[PDB]
Design an enzyme around this catalytic site. Structure first.
Site, PDB file in Angstrom:
ATOM      1  N   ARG A   1       0.859  -1.180   0.000  1.00 16.91           N
ATOM      2  CA  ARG A   1       0.000   0.000   0.000  1.00 16.91           C
ATOM      3  C   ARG A   1       0.898   1.233   0.000  1.00 16.91           C
ATOM      4  NH1 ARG A   1      -2.495   3.092   4.439  1.00 16.91           N
ATOM      5  NH2 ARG A   1      -4.715   3.547   4.102  1.00 16.91           N
TER       6      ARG A   1
ATOM      7  N   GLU B   1      -9.582   7.526   4.838  1.00 16.60           N
ATOM      8  CA  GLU B   1     -10.421   7.727   6.018  1.00 16.60           C
ATOM      9  C   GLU B   1     -11.367   8.908   5.816  1.00 16.60           C
ATOM     10  OE1 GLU B   1      -7.911   8.007   9.538  1.00 16.60           O
ATOM     11  OE2 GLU B   1      -7.377   5.888   9.432  1.00 16.60           O
TER      12      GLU B   1
ATOM     13  N   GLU C   1      -5.313  -0.851   7.456  1.00 17.89           N
ATOM     14  CA  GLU C   1      -4.351  -0.262   8.379  1.00 17.89           C
ATOM     15  C   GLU C   1      -4.478  -0.892   9.752  1.00 17.89           C
ATOM     16  OE1 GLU C   1      -4.041   3.998   9.007  1.00 17.89           O
ATOM     17  OE2 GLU C   1      -4.465   4.372   6.880  1.00 17.89           O
TER      18      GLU C   1
HETATM   19 CA   LIG Z   1      -2.689   7.627  11.608  1.00 16.66          CA
END
Ligand SMILES: [Ca+2]
Length: 334
Positions: free
Chosen positions: A45, A136, A246
């Protein structure tokens, strides 16, 4: 094994440039990507920034890094932050030069951007496995136009970005991903998607994967049980695969600002604990319908061992010997 066992090593070129180098489990110096590849890691990634003044993580930076990833035989997952710097729920700064006053202009710049990004990789003969339109984006993206006061604008922007990719010259269209933080929270995940899809600006056919961040040290609510439920509901409700894009676990955490989740409080802070956590996390993903994988975040960022958390060390490499920990093998075999 999971479909994807990855790592985000975006910082690599910055560390190598600063003179850094790594060693495999035999103490033999060797390019990090090859050390990871041999350990089982099959995907990398990379965070992409639009116009950072200092060039960090921009398109050229990512091309150099992706070339080596392809060489080592790993897939590529491009994490578009759609900003000139770090993008997250508390900061979604629109790229300098892009519009903060006209959605029409902004939708065009984003479409042109993803189209251009994909085309540049195609011109360099590099295939893209996954590409997320934003990082995000639970609190939206490209502020102010993409603030949550307008889920319609958010949907229209994601639609535009998605199609920039779909319209590119990349022989095979990369999997299009939408990435939200707090993957353990079903309420937050569901509200974002239900609300955005309700506007019709974003079509279910516009994207392919769901991506979520999952950390153990930012809230005791981040239990593996809540994650299991959230991932389960995402797939069942929207019928799309899920990916934990993540995650971290400390080899050292002298004093955490937050209490760890209950089903994780028995895991020690050590390489061994890092392995136990990863295997337990992989279990949840594997047991989920279409749970595709896990990507550890920045396992080799020497010099930033805490990785932004209250813990002391979340790396998977020894900050003194530059030697990778045995946990890399564990991640590679998830
Ligand atoms: Ca972070």
């Amino acid at each position: 094994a999971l479909t994807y066992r990855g790592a985000d090593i975006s910082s690599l070129l910055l560390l190598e440039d600063e003179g850094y180098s790594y060693k495999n489990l035999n103490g033999q110096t060797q390019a990090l990507e090859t050390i990871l590849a041999d350990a089982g890691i099959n995907s990398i990634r990379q965070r992409v920034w639009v116009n950072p003044s200092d060039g960090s993580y921009d398109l050229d930076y990512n091309l150099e890094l992706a070339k080596r990833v392809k060489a080592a035989g790993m897939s590529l997952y491009l994490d578009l932050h759609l900003s000139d710097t770090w993008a997250d729920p508390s900061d979604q700064t629109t790229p300098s030069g892009w519009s903060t006053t006209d959605l029409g202009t902004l939708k065009w710049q984003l479409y042109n951007y993803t189209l251009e990004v994909c085309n540049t990789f195609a011109e360099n003969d590099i295939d893209i496995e996954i590409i997320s339109i934003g990082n995000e984006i639970r609190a939206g993206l490209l502020w102010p136009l993409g603030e949550t006061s307008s889920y319609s604008n958010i949907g229209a922007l994601l639609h535009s970005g998605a199609w920039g990719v779909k319209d590119s010259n990349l022989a095979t269209t990369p999997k299009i991903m939408i990435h939200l933080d707090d993957g353990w929270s079903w309420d937050q995940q569901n509200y974002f998607y239900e609300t955005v899809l309700a506007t019709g600006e974003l079509l279910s056919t516009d994207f392919d994967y769901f991506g979520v961040s999952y950390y153990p040290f930012y809230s005791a609510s981040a239990t593996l049980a809540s994650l299991k439920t959230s991932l389960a509901n995402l797939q069942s409700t929207y019928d799309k695969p899920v990916v934990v894009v993540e995650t971290n676990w400390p080899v050292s955490c002298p004093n955490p600002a937050y209490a760890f989740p209950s089903d994780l409080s028995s895991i020690p802070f050590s390489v061994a604990g890092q392995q136990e956590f990863l295997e337990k996390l992989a279990a949840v993903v594997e047991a989920t319908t279409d749970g595709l994988g896990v990507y550890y975040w920045e396992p080799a960022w020497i010099g930033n061992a805490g990785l932004g958390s209250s813990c002391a060390d979340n790396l998977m490499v020894d900050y003194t010997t530059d030697e990778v920990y045995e946990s890399i093998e564990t991640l590679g075999e998830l």
